Structures are given as C-alpha cells and as structure tokens.
Amino acid sequence: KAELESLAGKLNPVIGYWDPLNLADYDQWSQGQEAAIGFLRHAEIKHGRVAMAAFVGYIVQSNGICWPWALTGGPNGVMHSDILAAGGPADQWDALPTASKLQILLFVGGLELWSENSYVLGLSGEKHYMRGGKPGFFPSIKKGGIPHPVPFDLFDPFGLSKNASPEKKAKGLLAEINNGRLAMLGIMAFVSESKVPGSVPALAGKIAPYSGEVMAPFAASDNLPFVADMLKSPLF
Amino acid sequence: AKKLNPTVGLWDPLGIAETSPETIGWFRHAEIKHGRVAMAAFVGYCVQSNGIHFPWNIQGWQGTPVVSFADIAAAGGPADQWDALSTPAKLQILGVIGFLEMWSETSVVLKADGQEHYVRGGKPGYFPKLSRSDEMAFPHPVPLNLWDPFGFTSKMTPERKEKALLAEVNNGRLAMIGIFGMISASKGLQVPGLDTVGIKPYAGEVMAPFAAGDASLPFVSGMLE
Amino acid sequence: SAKADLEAFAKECNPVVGYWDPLGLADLPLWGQDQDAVIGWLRHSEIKHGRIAMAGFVGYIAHANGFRFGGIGPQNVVPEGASAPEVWDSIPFLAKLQIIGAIGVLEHISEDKNFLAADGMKHYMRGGKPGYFPTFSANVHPMPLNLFDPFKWSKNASPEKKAKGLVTETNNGRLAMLGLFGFLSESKIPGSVPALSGIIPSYDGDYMQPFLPTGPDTSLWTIGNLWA
Ligand code: CLA
Ligand code: CLA
Ligand code: CLA
Ligand SMILES: CCCCCC(=O)OC\C(C=C=C1C(C)(C)C[C@H](OC(C)=O)C[C@@]1(C)O)=C/C=C/C(C)=C/C=C/C=C(C)/C=C/C=C(\C)C(=O)C[C@@]12O[C@]1(C)C[C@@H](O)CC2(C)C
Ligand code: A1ECV
Ligand SMILES: CC(=O)O[C@H]1CC(C)(C)C(=C=C/C(C)=C/C=C/C(C)=C/C=C/C=C(C)/C=C/C=C(\C)C(=O)C[C@@]23O[C@]2(C)C[C@@H](O)CC3(C)C)[C@](C)(O)C1
Ligand SMILES: CC(=O)O[C@H]1CC(C)(C)C(=C=C/C(C)=C/C=C/C(C)=C/C=C/C=C(C)/C=C/C=C(\C)C(=O)C[C@@]23O[C@]2(C)C[C@@H](O)CC3(C)C)[C@](C)(O)C1
Ligand code: KC2
Ligand code: KC2
C-alpha cells in the first residue's frame, strides 16, 4: 500500500507509522501485500468497535443496571436480574442459561458471514477488504437479500448520518481508530482487573473476582458435547 | 563554551573531550540536565527540611482513604518523604517526568520549533514548546508552558542568552557538587554535617519501595555501599 | 586472496598481535577442500563459538542470580537458587530435547542452500560470508520477523560500520569464550581462575553430556492434556 503511512500520520502527527515488528511486510496469507495491510486494517477496526461496545457494556453492567424484562422461556427461568446477582459482568455471561449464549454467538457469526460475502459487498459497491475495497465497511442488510423486508440497516439504522460531509466521515474514521485503540486498552485493563488484582495503578478494589476464564465463552453449566471434558484443567 | 572561568581551563582528566560531535553534545546535555536536576532537588530538599507542608489532602486524596499531607511530611527529611508516598503517586509522578522527558527528546516537535538533532544534541537544554500547531491537537491546549510560563524572558539578546547559559552551567556544576554533598551529609559523611539533617535512606537510589509486581527485592541491604 | 583477507582481518582485530597462527590450521586442507573453504569454515566456527559463548555468559549470569520467567513454564520445576550448572539439570528432559532440536533447526536453516540463495548468498565454504544468517524467506509458511535484526534498526549501517561490528564481535567472542570457560573451569577444579575462587560452587555432573543428570518427566501443558 504505503498509503497507511499518511493514515498513521493523520491519526497522530507526532508519531507516524509505528511498527517495530514491520507487520505490514508480513504476508501472513501469502496473497498480495495489499491484502495483508487490508486484513490488518480490518482486524484493527473490528477489534476497536468490539472493544468500545464491550467497554460501554462493562461500565453499564458493573453498577446495578439491568433491564426489567424477563428472559424466562415459559413459566420459569432467569428473571433477567438473577444474572446481575451472579457477580460482576463476567459471571453474568457464564450464567446466561445454555441457549442464550448460543444464539448470541450465532447472531454474531451470521453478521460476520454477511460482512464477508463478496456478492453482498459487491452489490453495495465495495469489495472484500483484502481484495481492494474499504476496510471496516458493513454492507447493507436491505439491498443484499433478506426476502422479508427489514426496518433498518446495521450501520446508521435511524438514518442520522446521511448526506454527511466526506471529510467529516474521514475524521470520523480516524477518531474511530483512535478511540478503538483506547477502548481496547480500557477493556483489557478491566479484564485484567477481573483476574489479576495487583495490576494497574487505578481500579483497586472496584472489580469482581470472577474465579474463571475470561476467554472461555461456554461455562461449566452448558450441556453441549465435550465442554465439561474441555474444562477439566484450568490454567494461569 | 571554551572556559567560563579563565583560571580553570579545560579540566578533562578522563579524556572524554575531543570526541565525536554527537558524544560531545550528549555529554553537554547530560551535564546541563544533571545540574538543573541537582539544583531543583537541592531547592526542594531545603524547602522540605525547613518545613513547607501544604494545607491539602482532602476529599479522598489517597484512594478513598484520606491521609493528611502533614502525616506524609512527619517522617523526617526528604528521603523519608520519598518513601512514604503511595505507589500510585510515585508512579504517576515518574510518568509525568518521563512524559516531559520524551516530549523534550521528540525530534518532530523540536524540528517544528526550529531546532537541531534530538536527544538534546544541537542547542542542548532546549525544551520544545507545547503549543501552537501540530502539537497537542487532541484537546489540552496547555495555557502554561515549561520555560518562562509567565513570559519573564520575553526579550533577551544572544550575548545575554549565552552569558545566562554559561552562568546556568556554572551554577549547575556547583549544584551537582552541592546536592550530592547534602545527600552525603544526610548519610553521615561529608564535611561540617550539623543542622540535624535527620536520617538517610538505604542509598537514596532505591526509587520506589513497597510496590507490587517487581518490588520483591531484598537486595537493598548490601552491595557494599 | 584467502590468506590476505585473513591477515587483514587479524590486523584489524589487533594491530599489535596481528596474524597469530602457531598451529597453522589455516594451511591444512581439512577435507581436501582448498584454502578458501577451509578459512571460511574456520571463520564461521570461530564466529559461532564466540556468539554462543557471549550468550552463554549472559545466561550464566541470569541463572546464577535467579531470573525466572514466571509461571507454568519449565522455570516452575527448577528450584529457586541452584547455580547456573544446575538449571540445565532440573528442566524436564523433553524441554532439553526440544531446545537442542530448535538449535539444530536454526543451524540447518543457516546452512540450507535454499535459505542462503533466497537472499542472494552462497555457502561460506563455497564463497559466502562467514557467520551470516539468511533471513527466513524460504520456509513454506511465512515468518514474521528475522533473526539477525528482528526490528531492522541496523539496515542503515555503512559497510565500514558493519566491518567494525564484525571485528568487535570477534574480539568480544574470544574474550567471552575465555570468561565462560573460566566459570566452567572454576566449577570443576578449584584454584584455576584465582578471581572466581569461592564464588562458583563445585559441580559433579558432566558438562559435555546433555542428558546426563536428565530432568524429570512432567507435563506442564494444561487444557486438553491428552498426553498424561
Ligand atoms: C489486535 C489489534 C490491532 C491490530 C490488528 C492493529 C493493526 C495495525 N496497527 Mg495498531 N494498535 C493497536 C491494536 C491493533 N493494531 C493498539 C491496541 C494500539 C494502541 C497501543 C495501536 C497503536 C498503533 C499505532 C500507533 C500505529 C498502529 C498501526 C497499525 C497498522 C500497521 C502496524 C501493524 O501491523 O501493527 C499490528 C500490531 C499488532 C497486530 C499487535 C500484535 C499483537 C501480538 C501478536 C500479541 C502480543 C503482543 C503484545 C500484547 C503487544 C505489546 C504490548 C505493549 C503495550 C507493550 C495495522 C493496521 C500503525 C498505523 O496507523 O498504520 C496504519 C501505527 O503507526 N497501531
Ligand atoms: C574454537 C574457537 C576458535 C576458533 C575456531 C578460532 C579460529 C581462528 N582464530 Mg582464534 N581465538 C580463540 C578461539 C578460536 N579461534 C580464542 C578463545 C582466542 C583468544 C585466546 C583467539 C585468538 C586468536 C588470535 C589472536 C588470532 C586468532 C586467529 C584465528 C584464525 C586463524 C588461526 C587458526 O588456525 O585457528 C586458531 C587455532 C585454533 C582454534 C586451535 C584449535 C584449538 C586446539 C586444537 C585445542 C587446544 C586446547 C588447549 C587446552 C589450549 C591450551 C591453551 C594454552 C595452554 C596455550 C581462525 C579463524 C587469527 C586471526 O585473527 O585470523 C582472523 C589470529 O591472529 N585467534
Ligand atoms: C541436533 C542439533 C544440531 C545439529 C544438527 C547441528 C549441526 C551443526 N553444528 Mg551445532 N550446535 C548445536 C546443535 C546442533 N548443531 C547445539 C545445541 C549447540 C550448542 C549451543 C551447537 C554448537 C555448535 C558450535 C559451537 C559449532 C557447531 C557446528 C555445527 C556444524 C558442524 C558440526 C559437525 O560437523 O559436528 C558433527 C558432530 C557429531 C557427528 C557428533 C554429534 C553428537 C553425537 C550424536 C553424540 C552421540 C554419542 C553418544 C555416546 C551416543 C549415545 C548413545 C550410545 C550409547 C548408543 C553443523 C551445521 C560448527 C560449525 O558450524 O562450524 C562451522 C561449530 O563450530 N554447533
Ligand atoms: C500456545 C502457544 C504457546 C505455547 C508455548 C509452549 O508450549 O511452550 C513454551 C515454554 C513453556 C511453556 C508453556 C507456557 C507458554 C508457559 C504455557 C502453556 O500452558 C498451557 C497452554 O498448558 C504451555 C507451556 C507449559 O508449554 C517455554 C519456551 C521456552 C523457550 C522458547 C526457550 C528458548 C530457549 C532458547 C535458547 C536456550 C537459545 C539457545 C541458543 C541458540 C539457539 C543460539 O545460540 C543460536 C545461534 O548459535 C546459532 C545456532 C548460530 C549463530 O550463527 C546464531 C546464534 C548465535 C543465534
Ligand atoms: C490530569 C489530571 C490528573 C488525573 C485525572 C490524575 C489521576 C489521579 C487520580 C484519580 C488521583 C487520586 C486518586 C484518589 O485519591 O482517589 C491522583 C493522585 C495523584 N497524581 Mg495523578 N497526577 C500527578 C501525580 C499524582 C500524585 C502525587 C497524586 C496523588 O497524591 C493522588 C493520589 O492518587 O493519591 C494516592 C501529577 C504530578 C506530576 C499530576 C499533574 O497534574 O502534574 C503535571 C497528576 C494529574 C492527574 N492525575 N492522580
Ligand atoms: C456529529 C456526527 O458525526 O454524528 C455521529 C455519527 C457517528 C459517527 C455515527 C457517531 C457514532 C457512533 C457511536 C455511538 C460511537 C461510540 C463510540 C464509543 C462507545 C466509544 C467508546 C470509547 C471508550 C473508550 C475509549 C474507553 C477508554 C478507557 C480507558 C482510557 C481506560 O479505562 C484507561 C484506564 O484503564 C487504564 C488503561 C488503566 C487504569 O489504571 C486507568 C484507567 C481506568 C483510566 C458519533 C461519533 O456519535 C457522531
Ligand atoms: C584470572 C582473572 O583474574 O581474570 C578474570 C577476569 C574477569 C573479567 C573477572 C573474568 C571474566 C569474565 C569475562 C572475561 C567475561 C566476558 C564477557 C563478554 C565479552 C561478554 C560479551 C557479551 C556480548 C554480547 C552480549 C553481545 C551483544 C550484542 C548486541 C547487543 C548486538 O548484536 C547489537 C549491536 O551489535 C549490533 C547488531 C551492531 C551495532 O549497532 C552495535 C550493537 C551493540 C547495537 C574471569 C573469567 O573471572 C577472569
Ligand atoms: C458497535 C460498533 C461500532 C462502534 C462502537 C463504532 C464507533 C464509531 C466511532 C466512535 C469512536 C466513530 C467516530 C465511528 C465512525 C464511523 N463508523 Mg463506526 N462504530 C461501530 C460500527 C460501525 C460499522 C458497522 C460501520 C461503521 C462505519 C463508520 C464510519 C464510516 C461510514 C462511511 O463512511 O460509510 C464512520 C465515520 C461504517 C464504515 O466503516 O464504513 C467504511 C460501517 O459500516 N461503524 N464509529
Ligand atoms: C547471540 C548471538 C550474537 C551475538 C552475541 C552477537 C554479538 C555482536 C556484537 C557485539 C559483540 C556486534 C558488534 C555484532 C555485530 C554484528 N553482527 Mg552479531 N551477534 C550475534 C548473532 C549475529 C548473527 C546471527 C548475525 C550477526 C551479524 C552481525 C553483523 C553484520 C555484519 C554484516 O552484515 O556485514 C554485525 C555488524 C550478521 C552477519 O552477517 O554476520 C556475518 C548475522 O547474520 N550477529 N554482533
């Protein structure tokens, strides 16, 4: 590419392209180099978006806030605040029955499948993020298919970004990258403060213990195959 | 600077002079920085030993607990005052000092200001200005500055600037003698100790004791010293 | 051209001593392999010995002081303070096997003609630069960063700077070989090196046997440890 030099300069004019590892030269997929920078950019943007979502979720789940809906399934089940009564926002994921985590993960998987599809991306006008195209672009959920009409698209559902200034959109992309890096640092600080108490200067005595694995989605209560055999040996 | 005092000359017994220009610039920068740090440390040590404890430490100033500033000040000299602050306080003070040092070493900011090669090379001792354009663009306008925040040095001739730099170098050498002599006088030693001067730390170079993660070091008892 | 380069490198290593070959190994055809290949092998082996000795000296300091990584790994079996000869005595046997295997993989990569000819180089006996390591650029699956310069901050060095770096490398290598075998000799016979008397404890096991006093057979791998 070599355009990422100028993008790194626009993100921060003091520190430009900062890569001690020189990972832009690393052709990890053995495609063109353009594909490698495209994959790295898309991975950074997706990581950042997930991190801001998880940061706001952690902040609003760590202090006694829960929806007054039910999540029962029929005359019994979780009251939607019993998960809040399991501890901080890492035992709550390990308390969402069995099917709730499955449906959440499958929704994210179908969303990523919609992201990756070149027929869907090509119908919007872009391509795959490594075969040229625009990194971080989510295609329209309306134009690509979905035979029953849906109300809104994922990006800008209410329409409050239309006819915006293109330079304002570029500034928003740069701010998204910077806030994504900052939110990744924040959410990993919180996740470290879950398990490790002695880390960081701040956040001392404000975080739930969570005697468990942050990186294990399925918990010991799941009745999926293996799982219990997969949780027979903890680690550090 | 050839020789500020004509009766001394070029006192270089170790032969570090007549070296590469980058080495000479680094040596001059280290001399100026050590002298300035020694002068500031001597002034702070004198103020702390006299007793200048501030009316502060209110509204959860210690991390939910409220320990008074005089309680930290009621430990002895400055050496005991540097061992009574919390780990976050010393860590954040060191981080602020490191941020200032890294901003001073920044070649982009120095070249924007109109300077020479960084790591305090050409024109050593020049702190870059944290204002105007292409610096600190993300909020934080920095209404104050590092050198002359009130603009007391607004106008100065180049000859006057050179004379003030030579005077600062001589005072920095005197302060590098003096602050080390004061620390030695705290640790017994020296000539005419007197003046109570409290007690001294293990070496003064321990930095941050009673921390977590890497501070499990019982090695500060020996190594001769 | 061979002996002339050898004289020049010896003169740059030390102007006073110069070329010192009392044994005359630079005139012996080692495998009936001319003069160029013999001096290339000798320089490559000297450079390799010096690099391994420098790394061994630093590692000996690190283990004698006690500088463990942390948890879970092979450092968890080694007792807290056993002196550097005994830290290659308590790591598991498979850890020693895999370490020696990775070193052999590195040697084989440094010698494989596909790796050398990838970045335009030939064998040191066949006419290449002694001590050079080809980067990684033939190893089927891509490698993230090279071994000589992992972060590539030496790519702006002048050839004169590289030559002075090689001379410093050889001198430091010789002096580190001498220091490291000072340590190993004091760990075996007392009173050899007078400075190191009483610092390094005596060791009974053989240094030249890798699996002598072999370590235990423990499985430090958790999660899905089907190899119990
Ligand atoms: C996994 C998330 C991720 C990904 C995929 C990227 C991807 C990228 N970053 Mg990036 N970055 C990230 C997180 C990430 N970043 C974070 C969290 C920060 C803030 C600390 C930054 C700050 C940053 C700057 C300042 C710059 C980049 C740049 C770049 C681009 C080229 C350099 C490169 O490939 O480095 C990729 C690096 C990685 C993929 C990280 C490797 C992770 C390893 C394998 C795991 C263990 C290492 C350890 C956790 C990291 C060290 C910790 C450290 C705090 C001490 C590339 C698109 C440059 C740019 O803008 O060019 C477009 C640039 O100048 N990054
Ligand atoms: C195994 C390590 C090793 C290797 C392969 C070499 C290889 C070489 N050295 Mg060298 N050297 C070494 C270690 C080594 N050195 C050490 C540790 C020192 C410091 C003492 C030196 C100091 C040195 C100088 C000053 C010079 C060389 C030079 C040379 C080159 C030509 C001389 C020759 O034929 O070999 C050298 C001879 C041998 C390697 C003999 C092999 C060892 C025998 C078989 C075993 C003896 C063991 C015995 C216990 C030793 C007793 C020591 C004492 C009682 C005398 C050649 C590339 C010359 C040069 O610069 O060319 C570029 C040169 O002038 N060497
Ligand atoms: C399996 C790993 C492996 C492999 C294949 C190599 C390969 C090589 N190394 Mg090497 N090396 C290794 C590991 C390895 N290294 C390790 C771990 C170190 C220590 C850090 C070194 C340190 C080293 C140095 C310092 C030098 C080399 C050199 C060399 C080259 C020539 C060696 C030679 O001809 O000797 C051939 C040696 C043998 C055939 C003996 C092998 C040992 C046998 C198998 C032991 C078995 C005996 C025992 C009694 C059997 C037990 C069972 C029995 C009772 C039935 C070659 C590229 C030299 C070089 O490149 O110079 C240009 C050189 O100077 N290596
Ligand atoms: C999951 C991915 C990661 C797995 C890693 C792993 O599995 O193990 C990793 C591990 C331990 C561990 C684990 C944890 C990681 C702690 C946690 C895991 O816990 C679970 C999951 O259960 C698994 C576990 C228990 O294993 C320990 C790794 C240790 C490691 C990697 C030790 C390298 C020594 C290098 C040496 C000695 C250098 C020699 C010297 C060399 C090579 C040379 O001098 C080479 C050279 O001379 C040559 C040949 C020629 C010269 O020209 C050039 C030079 C001079 C350079
Ligand atoms: C930019 C604004 C800013 C924030 C947001 C913070 C973060 C923070 C919190 C939230 C507390 C209180 C936590 C609590 O009590 O709950 C706190 C404290 C300290 N800080 Mg850090 N800090 C410095 C170092 C230091 C010292 C000595 C202490 C304390 O004594 C006190 C403390 O933690 O006591 C144990 C310096 C000096 C170089 C400067 C500065 O402006 O100089 C240029 C700052 C600025 C900031 N700090 N800092
Ligand atoms: C005008 C216009 O264009 O309209 C709209 C259009 C458009 C584009 C659609 C918009 C949008 C979309 C949205 C909703 C965007 C939301 C983005 C979001 C949600 C961004 C969260 C970031 C969270 C962060 C950075 C957390 C940091 C966390 C940090 C820094 C830490 O915790 C640091 C710290 O932990 C350490 C590291 C160690 C500790 O010792 C100390 C502490 C604890 C301090 C906009 C932007 O609304 C504008
Ligand atoms: C009898 C008596 O009394 O004598 C005593 C004396 C004494 C001294 C006490 C004793 C001893 C011990 C000794 C002799 C120990 C010697 C140890 C020794 C000689 C150890 C070398 C290390 C080299 C390293 C790690 C290389 C790093 C290399 C590096 C970091 C690099 O490659 C990077 C770099 O190079 C590039 C790539 C290019 C350039 O840009 C420069 C730099 C650096 C950036 C003894 C044995 O007891 C005997
Ligand atoms: C929940 C996840 C999430 C978070 C937390 C988040 C945060 C921020 C922030 C605040 C830090 C800013 C400032 C910001 C800005 C922009 N975003 Mg977000 N964004 C998220 C999701 C998506 C998705 C799915 C898409 C998207 C996009 C854009 C575009 C460009 C639009 C355009 O140019 O078409 C801009 C300017 C679209 C895209 O990247 O198009 C290339 C797109 O598909 N964003 N975004
Ligand atoms: C642990 C192992 C190790 C140690 C302890 C060590 C010590 C030093 C010292 C300090 C005493 C210096 C000053 C120094 C300098 C240079 N090293 Mg060494 N080096 C080690 C490893 C390697 C490897 C693997 C390679 C290498 C090389 C070079 C070159 C490039 C020359 C050129 O490109 O002309 C220069 C200037 C590369 C090369 O090609 O050497 C022929 C190469 O492949 N080095 N090296």
UniProtKB/TrEMBL annotation, chain A:
It is found in: Plastid, Chloroplast. Keywords: Chlorophyll, Chloroplast, Chromophore, Photosynthesis, Plastid, Signal. GO terms for biological process: photosynthesis, light harvesting. Chlorophyll b binds at R49. GO terms for cellular component: chloroplast; membrane. Pfam families: Chloroa_b-bind. The keyword Chloroplast applies. Chlorophyll a 1 binds at W18, E44, H47, E176, N179, R181. Its main location: plastid. This is Light harvesting protein. It comes from Emiliania huxleyi. The lineage of its organism: Eukaryota, Haptista, Haptophyta, Prymnesiophyceae, Isochrysidales.
UniProtKB/TrEMBL annotation, chain B:
It is found in: Plastid, Chloroplast. GO terms for biological process: photosynthesis, light harvesting. One of its GO terms (molecular function) is chlorophyll binding. The keyword Chloroplast applies. Chlorophyll a 1 binds at W11, E31, H34, E168, N171, R173. Chlorophyll a 2 binds at K33, E101, R120. Chlorophyll b binds at R36, L130. Transmembrane segments: none annotated. InterPro entries: Chloro_AB-bd_pln, Chloroa_b-bind. Signal peptide: none annotated. This is Light harvesting protein. It comes from Emiliania huxleyi (Coccolithophore).
From TrEMBL, chain C:
Chlorophyll a 1 binds at W20, E46, H49, L94, E169, N172, R174. Keywords: Chlorophyll, Chloroplast, Chromophore, Photosynthesis, Plastid. The keyword Protein biosynthesis does not apply. Pfam families: Chloroa_b-bind. One of its GO terms (molecular function) is chlorophyll binding. One of its GO terms (cellular component) is membrane. The keyword Chloroplast applies. Chlorophyll a 2 binds at S45, K48, E107. GO terms for biological process: photosynthesis, light harvesting. Chlorophyll b binds at R51. It is found in: Plastid, Chloroplast. InterPro entries: Chloro_AB-bd_pln, Chloroa_b-bind. This is Light harvesting protein.
